[PDB]
Write a protein that binds this DNA or RNA. Sequence first.
DNA 1: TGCATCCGTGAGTCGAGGGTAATAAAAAAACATCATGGGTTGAGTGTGGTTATTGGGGCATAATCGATCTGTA
Length: 49
Amino acid sequence: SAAVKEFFGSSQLSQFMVQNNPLSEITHKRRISALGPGGLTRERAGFEV
DNA sequence: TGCATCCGTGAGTCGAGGGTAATAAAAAAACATCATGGGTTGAGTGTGGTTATTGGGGCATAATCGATCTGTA
């Protein structure tokens, strides 16, 4: 339960869901990110990615 | 001299939630320490008490009107 709770809420890929519009809802749930565990960082990422 | 190796660097205001957790032993004795409760100091705040009065009203001792029967050309 500790590990699953840390992933659900304390991880980078789980963040508060935007609720301004239904469009914001859809475009936040249909989102692809290249960060988080095993991914790049904004400082590290160059140009090709 | 060439080689790998290590060591700093790299923006700017801003917002919103904002904290989570793999584990573990009990006895005993011994001692320290605060917590409450009851009793002296002591420290007040509390309350009447005598004696300084200064305006006010008062009674004396004087005073300036108001009203009528006797003396002078």
